[PDB]
Write an enzyme that holds these catalytic residues in place. Structure first.
Site, PDB file in Angstrom:
ATOM      1  N   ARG A 153       0.844  -1.187   0.000  1.00 59.59           N
ATOM      2  CA  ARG A 153       0.000   0.000   0.000  1.00 59.59           C
ATOM      3  C   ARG A 153       0.876   1.232   0.000  1.00 59.59           C
ATOM      4  O   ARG A 153       1.919   1.274   0.653  1.00 59.59           O
ATOM      5  CB  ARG A 153      -0.893   0.063   1.222  1.00 59.59           C
ATOM      6  CG  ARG A 153      -1.630   1.371   1.275  1.00 59.59           C
ATOM      7  CD  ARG A 153      -1.917   1.757   2.657  1.00 59.59           C
ATOM      8  NE  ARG A 153      -0.976   2.724   3.194  1.00 59.59           N
ATOM      9  CZ  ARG A 153      -0.987   3.140   4.456  1.00 59.59           C
ATOM     10  NH1 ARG A 153      -1.878   2.656   5.302  1.00 59.59           N
ATOM     11  NH2 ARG A 153      -0.091   4.024   4.866  1.00 59.59           N
ATOM     12  N   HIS A 216      -7.847  11.344  11.777  1.00 58.84           N
ATOM     13  CA  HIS A 216      -7.689  11.838  13.146  1.00 58.84           C
ATOM     14  C   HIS A 216      -8.946  12.552  13.697  1.00 58.84           C
ATOM     15  O   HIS A 216      -9.757  13.108  12.949  1.00 58.84           O
ATOM     16  CB  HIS A 216      -6.393  12.665  13.317  1.00 58.84           C
ATOM     17  CG  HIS A 216      -5.166  11.815  13.494  1.00 58.84           C
ATOM     18  ND1 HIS A 216      -4.598  11.571  14.725  1.00 58.84           N
ATOM     19  CD2 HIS A 216      -4.430  11.117  12.595  1.00 58.84           C
ATOM     20  CE1 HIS A 216      -3.554  10.775  14.579  1.00 58.84           C
ATOM     21  NE2 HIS A 216      -3.431  10.480  13.294  1.00 58.84           N
ATOM     22  N   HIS A 311     -37.644  13.275  34.356  1.00 55.48           N
ATOM     23  CA  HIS A 311     -37.016  13.699  33.100  1.00 55.48           C
ATOM     24  C   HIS A 311     -37.014  12.595  32.019  1.00 55.48           C
ATOM     25  O   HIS A 311     -35.976  12.310  31.417  1.00 55.48           O
ATOM     26  CB  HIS A 311     -35.601  14.244  33.360  1.00 55.48           C
ATOM     27  CG  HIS A 311     -35.535  15.235  34.484  1.00 55.48           C
ATOM     28  ND1 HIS A 311     -34.794  15.014  35.630  1.00 55.48           N
ATOM     29  CD2 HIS A 311     -36.125  16.444  34.645  1.00 55.48           C
ATOM     30  CE1 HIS A 311     -34.928  16.048  36.443  1.00 55.48           C
ATOM     31  NE2 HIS A 311     -35.730  16.929  35.869  1.00 55.48           N
TER      32      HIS A 311
HETATM   33  O1  LIG Z   1       0.542   6.293   6.526  1.00 56.12           O
HETATM   34  C1  LIG Z   1      -0.519   6.746   7.029  1.00 56.12           C
HETATM   35  O2  LIG Z   1      -1.495   7.039   6.298  1.00 56.12           O
HETATM   36  C2  LIG Z   1      -0.634   6.940   8.543  1.00 56.12           C
HETATM   37  C3  LIG Z   1       0.291   8.026   9.127  1.00 56.12           C
HETATM   38  C4  LIG Z   1      -0.490   8.777  10.190  1.00 56.12           C
HETATM   39  O3  LIG Z   1      -0.645   8.317  11.314  1.00 56.12           O
HETATM   40  C5  LIG Z   1      -1.062   9.958   9.944  1.00 56.12           C
HETATM   41  O4  LIG Z   1      -0.940  10.471   8.803  1.00 56.12           O
HETATM   42  O5  LIG Z   1      -1.717  10.497  10.894  1.00 56.12           O
HETATM   43 CO   LIG Z   2      -2.230   9.114  12.270  1.00 58.77          CO
END
Ligand SMILES: O=C(O)CCC(=O)C(=O)O
Ligand SMILES: [Co+2]
Ligand SMILES: O=C(O)CCC(=O)C(=O)O
Ligand SMILES: [Co+2]
Ligand code: NA
Ligand code: NA
Lengths: 387, 386
Positions: A153, A216, A311
């Site tokens: 990947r 994130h 409630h």
């Molecule tokens: O290789 C990735 O897509 C993960 C790296 C990572 O933790 C990020 O980009 O927050």
């Molecule tokens: Co990350």
């Protein structure tokens, strides 16, 4: 009289062409507690703990587990080798920078695939007889890995803040070379769901291989972004137990599963051992020494509670039996001490013995002795017990 | 460079789309519901004094509306409304009521600025007349009554993502003909998805002419993302709750929402809200409902501003904007006072030589009971302010 209008009806309403691209009940989790999770502020996993977490995940049903780079340290090279040797059913991945040394080491450890990340100096844009290329150095790596039978990947960092011209051209180039997957990462936690949707739908049009997403949770979008990514054709999602990762983490495993369960119960319930979820979170909670948040999805104290009375049944989209629990708790009062333990233990299907009740009841007292209880104290005190 | 490369993918003069004109992402109101929906939290038992503090602090924080439990729910509830409507808050004060003339009369009596009305199936019908939707004569009396006493009206329906679209949009339109300040959409059950939300809000935005309020439960992790898409589509008001507290795992959390809207537009959010008061606000509520701030809670949880160090580009939230001093760089498991010191300095608490001691002993007396949680550091420091 004046308090009515003509009824708004629409003008044969089957599926849209777009629906056929959706992966919402046919996708893979890539579980990253052992890579992204190692970046959580309180993660210091030793080998044994890495091994347990890995066994538990494979047993739970995830298709892939991702490990910290072997090149990162010698302890990592070893743990990688160790885990690759357990005989797990799921595929084992490691994260590498795009370099010939990193790859040689990666395949030596025995992984099933490398998640390669590319650096700006490794691809260029130039007019030739305009054109975009992976450099000769970089390309050899992918081919090397392919030639050793290992999955590759390919990713770019900070995908939602890159030039689209750059990103898409690069992923197309890489698709011509041929790889199993390309990944998209919201490193910074800024992507919005519809924005994620447009980007994956377009990528799905640009390349022909599989598509991986990494989100994130800084702004509370990680679960939503993963969902929309699946709708657009993404085939793989990274998760972490309790979401633990850098800053406040990434798409949490349980949260993802809750969302996908509502979308297709049969699929999720049969693929994953959902009643194993509490156990899985507790094992990680113990290692990284945190408490399961009171409002944690499925498994947190209050996820399965209804307020009783002053409630205040068919507003229960999650069925507690599907996740190992017994009921929604109907809360009318502030349960204290033993009363509070008994309620949660019963909800949780812990068949506690006479002595255990005491051991617990005594301990919960010694706790309130220090400061007032929190309702997460009840789950903490019960962490060691099983269904 | 070699053989395996490709022609650069480029698009074919680009600016904003007509859809963008309808977005309310930097121009919306929070309706703060810690004192209605938050009362349905498993561990919520607010008495009057505590309700009063929370209202004062929300008003100061800068929210435009606060929602209170129905004055007909109970006597204490009636009195607490009266009490809060008399405090002279800057924000508008709303109460939640079933659609009945009795409930409406007492709402006006208490002094609210507005009633959030929820209607029941028996109060509207479809019928053919010379295919028509009607709100019933006695239901409609309530709306006009409230309007005649000069109070704002919001009208809504429960379980909006699970209702028939024909009924729902027809009802909202009828309501709009009668004339109201606002209509509401609620994902009571926690099953809606962001694109679903967007579609529905855009359509609703086309059907009615009034304001649009949204209410989203977080059972499946969509509450914040639904709020955002609702705003992009034209929604004008979002319900929130401190720490999200409500039924089950709650609704769109105030802090989380503000983080999302901050990234979208720093200046707007930073100037409208007193962001450096978020922690004290969360701690007030955490204390009352006896929970701990989740370790990964947005902005304010222990780990929100951490970078792993070990074996400023990536900081979409600036710690200074929320009253904190920096991202902490973690390479070790801090223990005892070390861990207190770190978090306290991050939170901008200038602790006394004496206070450090009181804390160090107490964290010890805590770990001498069971092994520590990262949540414990925030817990021992709860009572201290910047
Ligand atoms: O290789 C990735 O897509 C993960 C790296 C990572 O933790 C990020 O980009 O927050
Ligand atoms: Co990350
Ligand atoms: O008045 C409303 O629309 C909100 C009621 C509620 O809490 C809900 O639907 O979950
Ligand atoms: Co609600
Ligand atoms: Na394609
Ligand atoms: Na309109």
């Amino acid at each position: 009289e004046a308090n009515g209008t003509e009824t708004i009806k629409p003008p044969p309403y089957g599926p849209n062409p777009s629906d056929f691209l959706s992966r919402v009940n046919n996708f893979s989790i890539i579980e990253s507690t052992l890579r992204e999770g190692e970046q959580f502020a309180n993660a210091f996993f030793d080998t044994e703990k890495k091994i347990q977490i890995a066994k538990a995940l494979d047993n739970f049903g995830v298709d892939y587990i991702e490990l910290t780079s072997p090149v990162a340290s010698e302890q990592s090279r070893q743990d990688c080798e160790a885990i690759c040797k357990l005989g797990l059913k799921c595929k084992i991945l490691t994260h590498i920078r795009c370099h010939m040394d990193d790859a040689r080491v990666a395949v030596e450890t025995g992984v099933d695939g490398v998640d390669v990340v590319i650096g700006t100096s490794q691809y260029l844009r130039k007019y030739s007889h305009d054109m975009t290329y992976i450099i000769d150095s970089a390309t050899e790596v992918i081919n090397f890995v392919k030639s050793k039978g290992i999955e590759v990947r390919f990713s770019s960092e900070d995908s939602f803040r890159s030039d689209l011209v750059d990103l898409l051209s690069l992923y197309k180039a890489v698709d011509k070379i041929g790889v199993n997957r390309v990944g998209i990462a919201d490193t910074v936690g800024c992507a919005t769901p519809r924005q994620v949707y447009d980007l994956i739908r377009t990528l799905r049009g640009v390349v022909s291989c599989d598509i991986e997403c990494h989100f994130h949770n800084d702004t509370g979008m990680a679960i939503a972004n993963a969902y929309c990514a699946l709708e657009a054709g993404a085939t793989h999602i990274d998760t972490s137990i309790l979401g633990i990762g850098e800053r406040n983490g990434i798409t949490p495993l349980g949260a993802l599963l809750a969302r996908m369960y509502v979308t297709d119960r049969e699929y999720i319930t049969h693929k994953y051992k959902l009643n194993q979820l509490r156990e899985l979170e507790n094992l990680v909670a113990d290692a990284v020494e945190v408490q399961i948040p009171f409002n944690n999805y499925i498994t947190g104290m209050c996820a399965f509670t209804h307020k009783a009375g002053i409630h205040a049944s068919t507003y229960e989209i999650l069925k507690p039996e599907d996740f190992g629990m017994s009921r929604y708790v109907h809360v009318g009062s502030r349960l204290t001490g033993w009363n509070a333990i008994k309620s949660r233990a019963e909800q949780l299907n812990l068949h506690l013995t006479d002595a255990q009740a005491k051991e617990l009841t005594v301990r919960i007292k010694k706790l309130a002795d220090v400061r007032t209880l929190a309702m997460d104290d009840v789950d903490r005190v019960l962490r060691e017990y099983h269904a």
